[PDB]
Write a structure and sequence with these properties.
Pfam families: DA_C (PF22903), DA_N (PF24137). This is Diels-Alderase phm7. By secondary structure, this protein is an all-beta fold. Strand 13 and strand 14 form a beta hairpin. The site of [(1S,2S,5R)-5-methyl-2-propan-2-yl-cyclohexyl]methanamine (HZC) has 7 residues, from loops.
Length: 372
């Protein structure tokens, strides 16, 4: 243990004026907190670990945050979501008074979100970013373990962004995928699941998914009002993308961070959206395509077309994304004809380059917030 960042909500670790993060470290996973001593009311940091099975029937995701959003609910927030094959879901925001992140002499990174009652979520990440382990010990809620492993010939290190511009969604907003393609497993037990509130176990093995590391001093409404995130496996392709559509505060500009791997090699890295590669992400409406669920809010899309293009590509890669199974649904405004919300999906996805028709699944989510 060589570097430690330990924050408690209760102690003044949260200041009401802006703070500049630590500089972006090129060719690093930047897993150590960029706001190590204190965060501002605007600042946020994310360590996210999402999994799903190869059959697109089971999902389990954990987002660990450091931000001020959960202070009046007594902690830092962790978002835990699960879907079973019968369509039953479990979704909770979990609050933890203490968040601790350490870098160890062996080069591993450890994180612990710790409650007053002794309950915790912990992560442990390899020095070369090829493995991550989470342990859940939240009494009355969820216990178990999650593992993500990169088995690629090419090291995660060789694919890490080499500049701020390759690590950024937009100025001052960092969003990264340091593990690249991962095999996943989950063994978990939930105390109360479904209408009957009976305990249930969840298992994934040799599944798919991905890890996100992001941070900013800029709060989300200042750079977006709509976002789509997905991690997916489509035959030999592994893809991960965040795409935002701007609020009035960025003159409605769109932004994206996107990566596309072929059998563990990085083939397309895009930090630009055209709607040094570029992505195009276009919503599919239910009057255009017969397959795909819509969400329950004002966004009626039934999926997306995702294209990755180079400057020296004729056709690049095109992926058709259809919403197949609902994971979570939560409003983000008062109800009405323009009521907004957030929707998580198991996605069905197909395509590749011209002449390719690979098929697989993703774990996706979309959000709108009522910022003009
Ligand atoms: C409620 C308003 C009309 C919505 C809010 C969500 C955003 C994505 C689009 C509009 C604002 N342009």
């Amino acid at each position: 243990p060589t570097s430690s960042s330990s924050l408690d909500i209760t102690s003044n670790c949260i200041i009401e004026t802006p703070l500049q993060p630590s500089d972006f470290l090129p060719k690093s996973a930047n897993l150590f907190p960029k706001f190590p001593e204190r965060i501002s009311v605007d600042s946020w940091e994310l360590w996210e670990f999402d999994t799903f099975d190869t059959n697109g029937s089971v999902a389990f995701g954990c987002s660990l945050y450091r931000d001020a959003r959960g202070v009046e609910q007594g902690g830092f927030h962790a978002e835990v979501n699960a879907l079973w094959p019968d369509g039953t879901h479990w979704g909770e925001t979990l609050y933890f008074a203490v968040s601790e992140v350490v870098e160890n002499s062996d080069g591993t990174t450890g994180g612990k979100w710790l409650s007053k009652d002794g309950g915790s979520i912990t992560f442990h990440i390899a020095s070369d970013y090829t493995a991550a382990a989470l342990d859940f010990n939240v009494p009355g809620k969820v216990s178990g373990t999650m593992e993500l492993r990169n088995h690629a010939n090419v090291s995660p290190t060789s694919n890490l962004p080499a500049s701020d511009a390759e690590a950024q969604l937009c100025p001052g907003v960092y969003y990264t995928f340091p593990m690249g393609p991962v095999a996943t497993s989950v063994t978990a037990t939930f105390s109360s699941v479904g209408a009957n509130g009976e305990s249930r176990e969840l298992f994934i093995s040799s599944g798919y998914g991905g890890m996100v590391r992001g941070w900013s001093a800029r709060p989300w409404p200042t750079f977006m009002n709509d976002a789509y995130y997905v991690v997916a496996q489509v035959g030999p392709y592994m893809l991960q993308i965040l795409r935002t559509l701007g609020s009035v505060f960025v003159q409605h500009k769109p932004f994206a961070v996107a990566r596309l791997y072929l059998d563990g090699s990085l083939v397309s890295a895009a930090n630009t959206v055209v709607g040094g590669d570029a992505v195009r992400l276009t919503k599919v409406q239910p009057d255009e395509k017969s397959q795909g669920l819509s969400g329950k809010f004002r966004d009626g899309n039934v999926g997306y077309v995702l294209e990755f293009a180079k400057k020296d590509s004729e056709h690049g890669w095109t992926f058709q994304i259809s919403h197949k199974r609902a994971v979570w649904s939560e409003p983000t405004s008062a109800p009405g004809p323009d009521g907004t919300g957030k929707s998580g999906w198991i996605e069905a996805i197909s395509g590749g380059a011209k002449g390719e028709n690979y098929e697989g699944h993703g774990f996706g989510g979309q959000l709108q917030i009522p910022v003009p």
